[PDB]
Amino acid sequence: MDAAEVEFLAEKELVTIIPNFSLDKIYLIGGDLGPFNPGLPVEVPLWLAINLKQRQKCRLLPPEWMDVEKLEKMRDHERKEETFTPMPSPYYMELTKLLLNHASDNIPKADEIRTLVKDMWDTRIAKLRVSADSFVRQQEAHAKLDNLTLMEINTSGTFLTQALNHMYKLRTNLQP
Amino acid sequence: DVELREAQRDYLDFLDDEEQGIYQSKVRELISDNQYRLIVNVNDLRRKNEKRANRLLNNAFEELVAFQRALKDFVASIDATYAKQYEEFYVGLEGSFGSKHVSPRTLTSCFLSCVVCVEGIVTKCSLVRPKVVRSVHYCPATKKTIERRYSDLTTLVAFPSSSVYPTKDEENNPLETEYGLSVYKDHQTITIQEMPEKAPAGQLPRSVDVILDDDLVDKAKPGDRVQVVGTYRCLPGKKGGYTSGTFRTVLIACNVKQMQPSFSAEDIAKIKKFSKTRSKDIFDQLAKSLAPSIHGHDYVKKAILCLLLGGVERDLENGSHIRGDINILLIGDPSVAKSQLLRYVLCTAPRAIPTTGRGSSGVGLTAAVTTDQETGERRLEAGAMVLADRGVVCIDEFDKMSDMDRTAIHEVMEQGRVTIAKAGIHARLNARCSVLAAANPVYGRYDQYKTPMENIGLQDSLLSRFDLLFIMLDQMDPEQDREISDHVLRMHRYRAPGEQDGDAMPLGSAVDILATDDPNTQIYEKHDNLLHGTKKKKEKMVSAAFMKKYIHVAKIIKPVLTQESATYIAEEYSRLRSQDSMSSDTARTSPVTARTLETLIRLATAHAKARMSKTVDLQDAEEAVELVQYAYFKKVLEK
Amino acid sequence: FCEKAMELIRELHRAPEGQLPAFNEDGLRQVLEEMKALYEQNQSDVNEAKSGGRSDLIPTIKFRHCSLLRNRRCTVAYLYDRLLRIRALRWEYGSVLPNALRFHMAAEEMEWFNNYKRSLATYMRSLGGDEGLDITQDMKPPKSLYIEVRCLKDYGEFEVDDGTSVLLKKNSQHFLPRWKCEQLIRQGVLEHILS
Amino acid sequence: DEGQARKSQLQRRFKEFLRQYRVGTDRTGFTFKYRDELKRHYNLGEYWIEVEMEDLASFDEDLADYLYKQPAEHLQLLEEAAKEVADEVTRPRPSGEEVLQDIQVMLKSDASPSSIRSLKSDMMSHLVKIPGIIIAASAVRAKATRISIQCRSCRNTLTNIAMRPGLEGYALPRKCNTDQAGRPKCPLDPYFIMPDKCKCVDFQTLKLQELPDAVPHGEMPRHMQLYCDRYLCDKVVPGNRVTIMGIYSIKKFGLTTSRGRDRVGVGIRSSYIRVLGIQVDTDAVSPQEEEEFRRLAALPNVYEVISKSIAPSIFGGTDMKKAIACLLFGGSRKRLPDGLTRRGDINLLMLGDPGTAKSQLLKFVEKCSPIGVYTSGKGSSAAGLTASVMRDPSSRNFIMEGGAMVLADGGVVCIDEFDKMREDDRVAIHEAMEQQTISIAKAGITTTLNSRCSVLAAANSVFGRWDETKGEDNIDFMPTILSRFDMIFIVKDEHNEERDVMLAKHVITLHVSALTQTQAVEGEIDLAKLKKFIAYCRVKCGPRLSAEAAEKLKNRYIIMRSGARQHERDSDRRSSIPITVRQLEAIVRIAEALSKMKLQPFATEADVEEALRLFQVSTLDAAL
Amino acid sequence: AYFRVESGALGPEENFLSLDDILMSHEKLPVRTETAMPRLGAFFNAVPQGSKLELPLWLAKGLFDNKRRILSVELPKIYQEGWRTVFSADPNVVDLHKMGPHFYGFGSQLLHFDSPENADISQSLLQTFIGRFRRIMDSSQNAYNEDTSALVARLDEMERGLFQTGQKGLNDFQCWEKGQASQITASNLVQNYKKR
Ligand SMILES: Nc1ncnc2c1ncn2[C@@H]1O[C@H](COP(=O)(O)OP(=O)(O)OP(=O)(O)O)[C@@H](O)[C@H]1O
Ligand SMILES: Nc1ncnc2c1ncn2[C@@H]1O[C@H](COP(=O)(O)OP(=O)(O)OP(=O)(O)O)[C@@H](O)[C@H]1O
Ligand SMILES: [K+]
Ligand SMILES: [Mg+2]
C-alpha cells in the first residue's frame, strides 16, 4: 500500500456540502445520495465533495471535530498520555490535508487547525518510533497498537515488518 | 556516595573470581613480580557486568577511583604487608572500547571525562621529574610528626592544594622535613601526533598532550608508534580572579602499548625446519622474495638482504672498534627502482629512518640543541642517524646533499659515533646504523663511454666508506623490456581481494583498529596469477610475515670465522688488490682497500647468519667474493 | 571453474533496475562447453573406477559433479531473471514492444513473450460478459474524470471516439478523459499537466 | 520582571515562527519547513538547524530587524525557542535519549555581502555578511559553556554558572558566601573551577583574507579573525572561499591591567567576528547533481564535450586541451601488497614559443581544478614549494609550515616560468613528483608529509624561440626531471596564412564579446559544473586496465623503446627526452583517466589507443 | 513490476534462483583436506591429504558430510571469538560492507557445518543486528534529499536493503504531502530507458 491508496480509502468518508444546483436523488452502487437543493446541506462522500468544489458547484462545511478548542484539547491529551489516544476520524490527516488544501476559503481558522493536526501527527509518529525501538530491543513476538490510523502505520510499516522478518529468522537459526 | 559504594562493591566482586580465577591469579602475579598496576581487560568486565563497564567508560574518574579502592582492598586481603608497602594501586585498561578508539584529530570535547584509546606517533618527550604525594614533618622540640597530602588538577580527584610545605607547628616550635619518609612519584609529559598517512588532504597532523605518572614513565620515546589508553580532562585555570573560559586538555594515561615479535613454539619449529631444509638455497630464496613488486635486480637484492642481516661488530680488549654494519650505495639511470627498493626497506625494517638529500641538514641528521620546555635548559634532541641507532637510514637523492652536510656523515658511516661540541654541550652519541643510499650520476644518465669514477663524481674516501656500490643501468633490450613490461602491467592490473571493481583509494582514513589486540604463520605466499604470473611456479616466494620472523631470529646469531674461510678470504683479497687492468675494458668503480677485506668478512658473516650457522664456511666466503667481484668492476665501452 | 557463469550472473546483478542487456550468447556457449568437458572427464573417471576398483577417484568425481550443478544453477538463474525483466516489459510499456528493446531479446525470449502476451489477453477477455476487463489499465487511484495532456513528441492521429480523432503534435494540449490517455502517458508520449 | 516579560514575549514569537512557518501553495501542497528540519536533524543526532533571514522577515519583520540590530540577545532567545520546538516534535523519545540537547541555530541570508574594508566602528555589535578566503585555521580547542566553582576553605560550591559566548571570559566571586560566625574567614579569591563539572564545546579560530579583486591598488590584502564553535568548527580549511554571517565584536579580557599594561595607545580594543553561518563558494553531492553527473558520463561523446570545455576562449590547442582533461581527472593510485605505492597523478610540461597561451591555460586549470595552486618558478624556493622549518612566536619552538605542494595535495599545482627556476630549487621537487611525499630532517624535526599533487608546468626554450637547427640545445632540463613528466608538449608557433586569419578573427570577436551578456553554449559544460563533475569522478571511480588492453600496451611499448634506442644510435647523441618504465606507467595513467571520465571500472583497448595517440603527439614527437 | 527472486540466505537453505545467494556462495572459506584427491592437483597430479585450501562456499557445502570424509571446514576469522568480542563492544562502528558484503547471509550458512561454536555464531549474529537496528532505522527514515553515501558506507547487503525500504517510505509520504503523488507519470522502466 502507498499513500495515494490510503487517501483513496479516506475519500469514502462522509462530509457535508451546500450545493448551488438542483438534482434528484442519485442511486449510486455505494448508496443513495439525497436530493440536492440550493442553499441546503447534504451529506456526500469526500471524493464527490472535492470534485464538486473544484467545479464551482458547492461550498464545504468543516466537520464537527475540526474545531480549534476541541483540537487543542485533543493535542494536549495526546501529549499527556503514553499510548495512542482515540482520534476524531480514522483518516484525520488525509481529511485535514484535502479539506484545507481545497476549501480553506470555507473553513475559518484553517491555519490553526493545520498546525494542531501537525502537532498531533508529530507526537503520534514519535510514539510509533518508540514502539518499534522497544519491539526490536526487547525481542517481542507481538504488539498491541490501538487507536493507530492506517496512514500512520503505512508511513513506516514496510520497514518495520521487513526488519522483524529478518530478526525472526536470526532468532530461529539453530532449529534443525 | 551510595553509587560510589555500589561501584566499589561491584569491582570487588569482579576481581574475586576463583568461584574461572583470572583476576585472582593476575593479582597474585602482581604481588609476585613486585608491581602495583593491574591491567584489566574491559571485555571481561563487560561480559560480567555491562552497566558497570559502560559507567567506567563514560564516567572515568569516579569509576577508576572506586576500582582502585577495591583493588587495594583485594590486595590487602591476599597479603596485607604488601598492601602497606605501596601508597596506591593503579588500574590499566585494554580491549575494545567501541567508539572510544580515536586519533588526535577525532579526540574532541565530547570525550571529556571518558576513557579513550588513542593511536599515534610520539614527537616530544620531557625529562622525568618527581612529584610530591605525601609529606612527613618532624618537630624536634615536641617530638611529634605530622603528615600532609597533596593533589592537583592532574590527580584523579582534582583539587588545587597548596605547594608550600609546613615550616612550624600551631605552637611556634619549628619543623623539619623527613625526605626519606615522604612519598614522591615520577612524572613526565609527552606529545602524540596523528599518523601522517591518515591525515586529510593538505592538512598537517594534529597532536595531543599526554601525562605519564609512576611506572608508565619512559615507556615511550620520540619516534615510537604507540597506543595510549587513558582519561580525557580539561585543566581550567584562572589569573587575577579571571578565567578566559578556554581550557587546555590533556590525556591522563592508564596504559601505554607499543605498536619485538612474539614467538610461539610452532613458529620456532617452522624456522628451524626452514633453516634445515636447504643448505645453499635459503639465501637465494630469501633475496628473491624481498621486494616482490620489483622485476629482478638480483645482486642488489642479495646485498640488501646482507645489509638487513648485518655483520658482527668487534670490540677489542684494548678498546678498539670494528663495525658490523653494512652500507650500500646505488647509483643509477632514471627509473630503475632505486627509490622503490629504499621505500621497501623503509616499510619492512624494524627501525628505518627516511631522509632526502635536499630536505636534510647536518643538524637534522645528527642532533639539535634547544631550550627545555621547563627551566629553559639547553637540551639535546636526537637527529635522524641517532634515531636510527641499531637501525637503518635510507638516504634518497644522495648526490643532492650539500658537501658540508655530506661530510657530517663520514664519522657515523665509519665509526658509528656522533660528537656534539656546541652551546656548552659536550656529548658522544651512539649512531650505529646502516646507510642505504641512492643517487644519480653527474650527467643524470650514465655515460658508458666515460669511466665509473668520472660518472659517479664522488671522493674516493666517501666511496671507500660504502661496503658495496651498485651501478644500475637502463639498457634498452627487447627481451628485458618484454619481461619488465609484463611484470609492471601485471602489477597495475592487480586488485586486492577485499576491494570491489571501480574502487578508488581515499585520501585519508578513519581509525580502523577497534581493539588493543588485533582480532585477526605460513612459510610460502599463496600463489596469485597476477602477482606471480602463469609460470609453472617452480620458484616459490617466502611470505612477508615469515620473512620478518626469520630475519629477526637470524640477526641474533653471531657466526665465528673459521680457518678455511679466512684463508680463502685472504687469498681472494690478494687477487682482487693485485690484479691491475684484470680486463683492459674493465675499470674499478671503487678503490680496493683493507676496508674491502673487512667488507668481505662482513658479507660472509651475514651469509652465514642467513643459514643460521654458527660458523662461517667456505660457501659463505664464496658468495661474498662473488658479490664483491660483481660490484667493484665495470666494463668501459670504446667508440 | 564456474567463473564464466559467475560473469553471466554479475552482468545482471550490476543492473538492479530491471533493464534488459543484450543476450550473452558467447558466455552461455562457453558455460555449455565447460559442462560438456566436465561431463566427459567424469565419465572417463567413472569408467576407470568401475574397471579397476580405484576408490581414490571418488572425491574427484564428486568435485566435478558439484561443479556441473553449479554451472547449471547459474545458467538457469540468469535465464529466469531475464524472463522476469521481459515480463515486466509487458506491464510497463504494452503489447507492442519498441524495436530498440526487441533488439536485446533472443528469438526464444521473443517466443516466450508472445506466448505470455496471448495468455494474458485470454485471461483478461474471460473476466467479463463482453471484452472482459483490461487490468493493465487503472494503475493508480482515479481522481478526476478529465485531465489535461501535452504532447511530448509527434504521434499523428489518435482516436478519441470511433467517429472523431485528434492529431497529436508536439506542444499541443488536449483536455481528454483519463482512461483514453493513461496508456500514452505511461509510454512517455503524453505528459499530464496539473494546474 | 519587565525585562523578563519582554524576553519571554520575544521567545514566544520566535517559537511561533518555528512552529508555524510553511512553504508551498494551495495548488501543490504545504511543508512545515523548519519544524520538519529540526525533527529530522534531531533524530539523526545533528543538533543544529539553519534559518533564512528572509523567511523570518516574512513571518515577522520586527523579529528580523531585532536580530540584525542586536544579534546576541535575540539569537540566544531564538536558540531557546529552537530547543523548545525540538522537544515537542520528538517529545516521546526512546531509552538513552531522555536528556534534551541544545540546538545551534545557524543564519543564512540572500542579501548582498559587504567587504572587510567597509567594516567600520558604527557597525560594532551588529550582524554582518563578509566574503573572503580562509588563509589559516587553528587547532580545535575546548570552550566552557557552563562551570561549577568551589571554595578552597569551606568547600561551598556554586554550580551551573552560565558562560558568555565568544572570546569572553568570566570573573569569579571575590568573596565566599559561607557564614562569618564560627569558621576562620575564607581567603580572598577562594573559588576554583572544578574540572569534571565543566561543560565544553569545540571552538576554532580562523583568518579571513579579503578577496583579491577587492584589494585597493598598491595595498597588501587585509585579514580578519573569526571565532567558530560547535558545528561551525572544522568546516572550512585554508584555501576555501567563503561568505560568513557573524557578529562584529570586541575581545573582553580581564578588566585589570595585569603585567602593568602599557599599550602604545589608550582605550584601543581587539576586534573579531563571531561566526553564525558559513557558505562555501564554488570559486556533499545532492541526488539531483549525482543523477546529472551520471548522465554526463554516459554521453557517447563525453570526451569531446569535456575537451571543448577546457579554456574555451583559447582558439586551438585541441591535443593539449585533451591532455589537460586527462590530468584533471587523473589515474588510479595503487598500493601493492608489499607496501610499495604506484602514483596515479599525471604530470604535464608545455615547452614552447612565446605568446601561445601557455600561461592562460595554467590560469584556467587553477580555476577549474577542485584543488588548484598557481605559482611562479621565478618567485619560488625549495622550502616554499615543499615545506619550511621556522620558529613559532608563541611557543618559542620549531614548527613546520607547508609549501605549495602541501597546499595542493589532492589537486594540481601550476608552475609557470618553470625554466626560470633555480637548479637547487627545481631539484627539491623530485621526491614529491614521484613518491608523492616530502621528507624533512631539520632542527630536530623528522617527519614525512603527503604531496599527492599533479604538476602542470610551462616554460620557454633556451633561445627564446625554438630553433630547429640547434636541435638538442633547445632543452636545458636534466633527464631526471624530464622522465617525471607523463607528457611533454613542444609548442611551436607555426606561421600559416589560413590559420593566422582564423585566429585573428577569433581574438577580435573575443574582445568585442566582452560587452555581450553571458550566454550558455550548447556543446560545453560551465566551469562550476565541470569543477564539481571532476571532484565527483575522482572519489567514485578508480579504473584498472583490462587484460586485453594490457597486451596491446605491452607490444607498443617494446616498439617505442626500440625506435628510441635506434634513433639515439643513428644521431650519436643521447636524446634529451628519455623513454623509461615511467613512460609506460604514464600511458596506463592516461588510459585510466579516460575511463574515469566515463565512470567505467575497466579501461578498454580504445582507451589505450587514445592514450597512445596522446603520447605520440606529445612526447615521442619531442623525442624524435 | 520487476521483482527479482529474493534472498533466502537467512533460512535453512538459500534460494536456487537468487542472484544475491549465488554471489554470496561464491565467497571463499578455509578448509583442510581429509583424503588424497587425485587428478585435481593442477587446480591447487593429486592434492595431498592434510592440505590447506580456500574453497568457494558452494563447493565446500557440496563436498562436506557430517563425518568429515573429504574435508573439514574452519571458520573465517570474522566469525571467530576475537572478532565476536569486538562486535559486542559496539556493533555500530564495525564496517560490515568491507568485512563481507553478505555478512549475515554468509554467517547464517556457516551453521550448516556443525561447528562446536554454532551457538556462539548464532547469538553473535542476532546481537549484532539488534545493536545496529536503531541507527539503521533513524538514518534511513530521516535522511531526506541528502547524500547517503556516508550513511550506507558501513552497512552490509541485507542492511542496505532495509535502508532502501526506509528511504522509500520517507520519500512516498513527502511526495504525497507536497501534492506530487496525484500526477500520472511515465513508468519507471520507460524513464530509465528513454531518458538515461
Ligand atoms: N624493474 C622494475 N620493476 C618494477 N617496477 C619498476 C622497475 N623499474 C621501474 N619501475 C617503476 O617505475 C617507476 C620508477 O620510479 P623510481 O622512483 O623507482 O625510479 P628511480 O630509479 O629511483 O629514479 P630517479 O633516479 O629518477 O629518482 C616506479 O613506478 C617503479 O615502480
Ligand atoms: N591561440 C590563442 N587564442 C586566444 N588567445 C590567445 C592565443 N594565443 C595567445 N593568446 C592571447 O595572447 C596573449 C598570450 O600571452 P600568454 O601569457 O598567454 O602567452 P605564453 O604562451 O604563456 O607566453 P610566454 O612564453 O611569453 O610567457 C594572452 O592575451 C592570450 O590570451
Ligand atoms: K609582554
Ligand atoms: Mg628516485
Ligand SMILES: [Mg+2]
Ligand atoms: Mg607565459
Ligand SMILES: [Zn+2]
Ligand atoms: Zn567560604
